[PDB]
C-alpha cells in the first residue's frame, strides 16, 4: 500500500531565483502547469511541492531555464531517492 515517511507531497527546488522576484511568481508558474499545493521561497532557491507528480516533471521541463526577471531560474526534482514498487508495466 502506499507510504509517506516525511513531507508526502512532490518537492521541487528551484535556483537562481532573481533577487526582484516574488513568490506569487513563482506559484504561479508552478500553478499554470499543474496544481500546487505548497509552493515557499527561500534566500536564493526555492521549493515547490506539487500534487500530481505527471504535473510535476512537466513542468521542471518547461521551467528548468525559463528565463524570469532576466534571471534563468534552475528548477530540479528535489526528491533524489526513487521507491517503484511493484512489477513495470507491459
Not at 9 to 16: A, E, L, P, S, Y
Not at 56 to 73: F, M, S, T, Y
Request: with cysteine.
Amino acid at each position: 500500500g502506499s507510504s509517506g515517511s516525511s513531507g508526502n507531497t512532490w518537492k521541487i527546488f528551484v535556483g537562481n531565483v532573481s533577487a526582484a522576484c516574488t513568490s506569487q511568481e513563482l506559484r504561479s508558474l508552478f500553478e499554470r502547469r499543474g496544481r500546487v499545493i505548497e509552493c515557499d521561497v527561500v534566500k536564493d532557491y526555492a521549493f515547490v511541492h506539487m500534487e500530481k507528480e505527471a504535473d510535476a516533471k512537466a513542468a521542471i521541463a518547461q521551467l528548468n531555464g525559463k528565463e524570469v526577471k532576466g534571471k534563468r531560474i534552475n528548477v530540479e526534482l528535489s526528491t533524489k531517492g526513487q521507491k517503484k514498487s511493484g512489477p513495470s508495466s507491459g
